[PDB]
């Protein structure tokens, strides 16, 4: 009975981050699960049931998303930062729903993206000249720069290659940032391993 239609609430629930640290590796994709639509091996059940009976506006927040799995809960609800606001309700308005959370990654939808920004940089002093500043004096210095203030950019390195890449991986909350990096390395390595397996089948089949 809230003022936001159903797809608004659904979209809004999809974007709430859920703690995924140790559970995401264990759960299966519903593609791979041998069950029906759902099961505890490939999904997590959430329930939300709020009714504004009192005169002040009721803030239906992520704290009202009750899970069957204690490990997978809304990040803000984890034991400061306030809870994500799902909808504001007026006296007499009511929201009752039943969600299921799945395993996915950011290629399918940004809600499965664990990062709240990935700062990536290399060659802070423009030594490789991969950028060409028309007026190098006008540009601020990188936080990773090692140059005296009179010097705007490093002397050009003809024999140089990009090395020393700087990262700042900010987490949306679902995974720890170091878990994001470790899971990224493992996922890239398994992509390459699967590619090599299929490569071997194609080579031997010829």
């Amino acid at each position: 009975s809230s003022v936001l239609h159903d797809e608004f609430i659904a979209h809004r629930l999809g974007l709430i981050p859920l703690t995924s640290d140790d559970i995401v590796d264990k759960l299966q994709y519903s593609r791979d699960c041998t069950c029906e639509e759902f099961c505890p091996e490939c999904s997590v059940e959430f329930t939300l049931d709020v009714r504004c009976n009192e005169d002040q506006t009721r803030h239906v927040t992520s704290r009202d998303l009750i899970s069957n799995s204690p490990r997978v809960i809304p990040v803000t609800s984890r034991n400061e930062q306030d809870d994500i606001l799902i909808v504001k309700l007026r006296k007499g308005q009511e929201l009752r729903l039943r969600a299921y959370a799945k395993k996915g990654f950011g290629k399918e939808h940004a809600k499965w993206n664990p990062t709240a920004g990935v700062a990536f940089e290399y060659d802070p002093d423009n030594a490789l000249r991969h950028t060409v500043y028309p007026k190098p004096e006008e540009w601020p210095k990188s936080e990773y720069s090692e140059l005296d203030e009179d010097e705007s950019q490093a002397p050009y390195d003809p024999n140089g290659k990009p090395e020393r890449f700087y990262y700042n991986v900010e987490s949306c909350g679902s995974l720890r940032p170091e878990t994001i990096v470790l899971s990224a390395l493992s996922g890239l390595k398994k992509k390459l391993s699967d590619l090599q397996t299929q490569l071997s089948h194609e080579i031997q089949s010829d």
Partner: protein, 67 residues
């Protein structure tokens, strides 16, 4: 109508910051200092909080369909 959950650009959660942002503004913070207190350092998330219009508060001035 309501504060978005994530920042459209980076995907940082801003849904839990609207109420805190308003509370800081009535605490006589400037909008910039308030956005700094909430940890919105990229101008995309500052855009999200600073340009938000809480229309849901006006939609809650109408009685619902059922009592």
């Amino acid at each position: 109508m309501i504060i978005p959950v994530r920042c459209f650009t980076c995907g940082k959660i801003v849904g839990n910051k609207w109420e805190a942002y308003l509370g800081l503004l009535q605490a006589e913070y400037t909008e910039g200092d308030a956005l700094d207190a909430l940890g919105l350092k990229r101008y995309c998330c500052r855009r999200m909080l600073l340009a938000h219009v809480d229309l849901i508060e006006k939609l809650l001035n109408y009685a619902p369909l059922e009592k």
